[PDB]
């Protein structure tokens, strides 16, 4: 959990994103939250990979907010 400004979440469900802008993931994956884009979407990334993109807030259980 290196960066103090990042947030932290766990995927609640599989998320199949429609485009390259969305980051798809599977239930139970940990996600590093980078920013909250609006009321419905985070941008995040998966630790130890190059996966990054947006996904709905309703698909993740938030441990710590991004700053």
């Amino acid at each position: 959990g290196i960066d103090p400004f990042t947030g932290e979440a766990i995927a609640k469900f599989n998320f199949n994103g429609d485009t390259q802008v969305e980051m798809s993931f599977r239930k139970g994956e940990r996600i590093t939250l980078l920013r909250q884009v609006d009321e419905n979407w985070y941008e995040g990334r998966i630790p130890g990979t190059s996966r990054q993109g947006i996904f709905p807030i309703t698909y993740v259980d938030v441990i710590k907010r991004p700053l």
Binding site: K12, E22, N40, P56, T58, Y59
Partner: peptide, 10 residues
């Protein structure tokens, strides 16, 4: 059940 996916950000 996974919730419906909302419209992307504006």
């Amino acid at each position: 059940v996974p919730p419906p996916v909302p419209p992307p950000p504006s």
